Amino acid sequence: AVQQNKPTRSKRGMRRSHDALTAVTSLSVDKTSGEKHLRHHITADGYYRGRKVIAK
Amino acid sequence: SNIIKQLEQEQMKQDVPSFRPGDTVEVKVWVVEGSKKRLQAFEGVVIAIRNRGLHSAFTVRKISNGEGVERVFQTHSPVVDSISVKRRGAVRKAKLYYLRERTGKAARIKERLN
């Protein structure tokens, strides 16, 4: 339940080796408006695959 | 799948009479005694029917000399010969499992005759 000796910075650091975040690195430019967005996601303006899908 | 279907449809017997639960049928099954290929009878009330193609089965409850005897029958199995129906009951339930606790006058049902 409790530890007998405290973990070091090594044991803490080697545990956090897999806690690093992952980048997206796959930004897709829009077909018509040419704005960056995620794959299979609409843009902030409301464009998806060139069509103004949201009209809002 | 269709591969299952062609293997099953060549084993299903075409001449199957259409019976509903509650119908008092008379089933003849092939019984063997070593060298005696006999055909004994089993008459009772149908309480459960499941029709899954070749795996079609129906349950017949018969009140023998004493307690009742339940026996299912594989419809397309070669062990059965005739599934000829005597009476046509008038019930409104697919599974008549409540007939197990009723006996005597409380277990009989009405004729359909529609």
Partner: protein, 122 residues
């Protein structure tokens, strides 16, 4: 499907009416008994003029089960009550002379010929 402490009805005129199965014979750690297995039982109820009395320890063979016995074609024959026929302890011959209720075709095993001959059905 008969195990220990199971109540069984008596399907012959041996005197008992209502018994207790106390041991499933025929193998170590054997749980259940078939429609053709020998089991050691004891008698919990008997008629006044019976051949046996309450509390006798003797062998019996199950002839009817509520679970039922499955035929090789895929069908099953399920009864509404667990019945049995009392047997002598030394010899597997039955004690009674008349048998009430039907039995199964699986009972034909060259030692129960006296049983299936007195059976009124199947």
């Amino acid at each position: 499907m008969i195990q220990e402490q199971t109540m069984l009805n008596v399907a012959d005129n041996s005197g008992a009416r209502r018994v207790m199965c106390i041991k499933v014979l025929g193998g170590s750690h054997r749980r259940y008994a078939g429609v053709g297995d020998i089991i050691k039982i004891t008698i919990k109820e008997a008629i006044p003029r019976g051949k046996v009395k309450k509390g006798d320890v003797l062998k019996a063979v199950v002839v009817r089960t509520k679970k039922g016995v499955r035929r090789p074609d895929g069908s099953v024959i399920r009864f509404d009550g667990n019945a049995c026929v009392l047997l002598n302890n030394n010899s597997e011959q039955p004690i009674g002379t008349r048998i009430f209720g039907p039995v199964t075709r699986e009972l034909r095993s060259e030692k129960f010929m006296k049983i299936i001959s007195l059976a009124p059905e199947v």
